[PDB]
């Protein structure tokens, strides 16, 4: 009726969306290699004839928290965590290359090296890494080199077979896709395998969700949500009062 | 419409993409307390002007009925 009902409704609806965005981070505190999503609000003015008094606010995801996660020491050979900044190249079920930070690796019955989510890990050849089937000792190098020991072979047979593809692009050019894999915003952009990133083998990288940061965002989203609801109530209260004009 | 001249509230969000050289991001200078007072004041001022117009509407009608 006054268009301030919808101006406040559109703000209250967006505050719920930001609340859900923060809720996903808290639901994913223990997730491995999880980058917390950032939430903010953007002011978009309604340009047109009349006084510039109506400005909408909509929530967006400007970026992600690319800080180093909490490293968990597991003493497992097939667990690796990226030191500092970096990524691991994996292809999902669609055969589409995407960057990940989950270094919880495993070997299937055929020998292909996958991660906890089943994404095949790429290597030097840019093809999924395949290991000889009857292994005896698998050690992951600090730079990503994979050295294996054939079954029954003596100690002095630690030959390298593959090198884990570690990619360190600009963090501002990466977006989180629909399946948690970060990809270039510009499509058809090759992932250059960096040789500077290092793996801290024997440990797993946790999530970087700042629990306090989400909680203080929640309490501010609640108060701003409630204040706009009062604006909706006072908008209809004014409308009801301004109805006796035609009540002759 | 004229914007308020109060300084923007600077917040320390150094890891934010929009942070400046010192890690500060700036946010609107909207103060909750004064905006709530405007919500109360504008609504009560709006409704009392309807009362005057409604009362003034009656006075015109009684002038029409004057004499008969």
């Amino acid at each position: 009726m006054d268009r301030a009902l919808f101006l406040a409704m559109s703000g209250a609806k967006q505050n719920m969306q930001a609340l859900q965005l923060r809720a996903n981070n808290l639901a994913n505190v223990s997730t491995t290699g999880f980058r917390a999503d950032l939430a903010q609000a953007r002011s978009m003015q309604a340009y047109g004839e009349g006084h510039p008094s109506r400005v909408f606010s909509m929530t967006e995801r400007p970026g992600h928290n690319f800080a180093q996660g909490s490293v968990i020491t597991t003493g497992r050979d097939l667990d690796v965590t990226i030191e500092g900044s970096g990524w691991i190249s994996v292809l999902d079920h669609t055969g589409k290359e995407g960057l990940t930070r989950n270094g919880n690796l495993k070997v299937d019955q055929n020998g292909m090296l996958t991660n906890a989510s089943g994404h095949l890990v790429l290597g030097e050849n840019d093809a999924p890494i395949t290991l000889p089937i009857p292994l005896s000792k698998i050690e992951i190098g600090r730079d990503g080199t994979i050295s294996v020991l054939p079954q029954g072979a003596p100690a002095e047979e630690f030959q390298a077979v593959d090198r884990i593809k570690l990619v360190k692009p600009n963090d501002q050019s990466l977006f989180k896709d629909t399946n948690g894999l970060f990809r270039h915003k510009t499509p058809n952009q090759p992932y250059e395998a960096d040789a500077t990133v290092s793996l801290q083998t024997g440990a797993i990288e946790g999530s970087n969700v700042n629990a306090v940061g989400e909680m203080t965002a929640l309490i501010d989203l609640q108060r701003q949500f409630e204040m706009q609801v009062k604006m909706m109530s006072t908008a209809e209260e004014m409308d009801k009062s301004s109805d006796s004009l035609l009540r002759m | 419409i004229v914007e308020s001249d109060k300084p923007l509230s600077a917040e320390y969000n150094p890891d934010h993409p929009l942070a400046n050289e010192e890690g500060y991001i700036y946010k609107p200078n909207v103060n909750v307390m004064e905006e709530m007072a405007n919500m109360i004041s504008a609504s009560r001022a709006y409704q009392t002007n309807v009362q005057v117009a409604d009362s003034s509407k009656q006075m015109l009608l009684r002038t029409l009925q004057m004499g008969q």
Binding site: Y47, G48, G50, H51, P52 | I1, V2, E3
Partner: peptide, 23 residues
């Protein structure tokens, strides 16, 4: 007129020479 009053039109800006030049 009031000084410093906001305008109800997009704010001519920098990128896209189009605005930086046309008055």
């Amino acid at each position: 007129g009031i000084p410093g009053a906001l305008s109800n039109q997009p704010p001519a800006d920098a990128s896209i020479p189009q605005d930086v030049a046309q008055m």
